Design a protein around this ligand. Structure first.
Ligand SMILES: CN(c1ccccc1C(=O)N1CCc2cc(S(=O)(=O)N3CCN(c4cc(C(F)(F)F)cc(Cl)n4)CC3)ccc21)S(C)(=O)=O
Ligand SMILES: [Mn+2]
Ligand SMILES: [Mn+2]
Length: 242
């Protein structure tokens, strides 16, 4: 089976999500043919030179899955678009493009974070265009770490002071551009399986969940497609009247 996750939004103030992700990497992921992380692995990223210990702890844990023989792949989210090749090397992950077409047991599947499908959020798309401009990334990454941390903290506060869903036509256009009947994405935090029509045939759009209270993954096998919700930790059973 091939596994997909997204929207973990890891951060040091949420240690329970980190613990659930480490348990996932130590168990379930080790049996996978491959693991794909479709963006928003981290709540924020200001560059690969950041000494945040959470970054090394996560890199080591992913690298152990890779060393155990499970290739791991990453598509950027809107939160963590600055993840680069230094972190790819540290973690053993392979960085992928904004859109990729995969062969999953004979089934053609498009994968992306999903924010580029949210063409009705013009203000998000304006932000995205700015922070994906190469000279703007190069300028930001040149700034001292402590300045970058101050900028990011301020920008997060400003944003906090509701993620828009995908545009249906943008979904059809992406699935027809790639001539696929299957699409897996995250970003909208609305886990679902949607049936639509693309390329003159039934088509499906599978959406991952955010890791709020529990984890979410999509498991693709040669036989089926599974959207799975599971607890972060091993909830031990323990023991009413008639
Ligand atoms: C869907 N969302 C959004 C909706 C509408 C608009 C935006 C978002 C969104 O995605 N936002 C907004 C807040 C924010 C902070 C981070 S960050 O903290 O990781 N970090 C990244 C690197 N970064 C700079 C800064 C600059 C410069 F200074 F030049 F401006 C350039 C460069 Cl190249 N990177 C500093 C901030 C990442 C993403 C987001 S929402 C609700 O927020 O989830
Ligand atoms: Mn997200
Ligand atoms: Mn997102």
């Amino acid at each position: 089976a091939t596994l997909f996750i997204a929207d973990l939004h890891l951060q040091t103030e949420e240690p329970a999500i980190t613990a659930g992700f480490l348990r996932f990497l130590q168990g379930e992921a080790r049996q996978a043919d491959a693991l794909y992380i479709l963006g928003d692995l981290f709540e924020a990223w200001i560059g690969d030179d950041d000494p945040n210990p959470l970054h090394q702890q996560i890199a080591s844990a992913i690298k152990a899955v890779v060393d155990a023989g499970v290739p791991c792949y990453f598509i950027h989210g809107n939160r963590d678009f600055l993840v680069g090749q230094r972190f790819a090397r540290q973690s053993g992950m392979i960085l992928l493009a904004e859109e990729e077409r995969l062969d999953l047991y004979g089934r053609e599947v498009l994968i992306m974070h999903g924010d580029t499908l949210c063409t009705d959020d013009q203000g998000y798309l304006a932000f995205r265009a700015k922070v994906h401009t190469p000279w703007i990334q190069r300028l930001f990454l040149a700034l001292p770490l402590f300045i970058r941390h101050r900028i990011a903290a301020r920008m997060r506060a400003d944003s906090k002071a509701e993620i828009m869903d995908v545009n249906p036509q943008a979904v059809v256009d992406a699935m027809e551009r790639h001539h696929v009947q299957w699409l897996i994405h995250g970003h909208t935090h609305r886990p679902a399986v949607h049936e639509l029509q693309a390329n003159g045939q039934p088509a499906w759009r599978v959406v991952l969940g955010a890791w709020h209270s529990e984890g979410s993954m999509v498991k693709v096998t040669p036989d089926d497609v599974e959207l799975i919700h599971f607890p972060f930790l091993e909830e031990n059973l323990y023991f009413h009247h008639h």
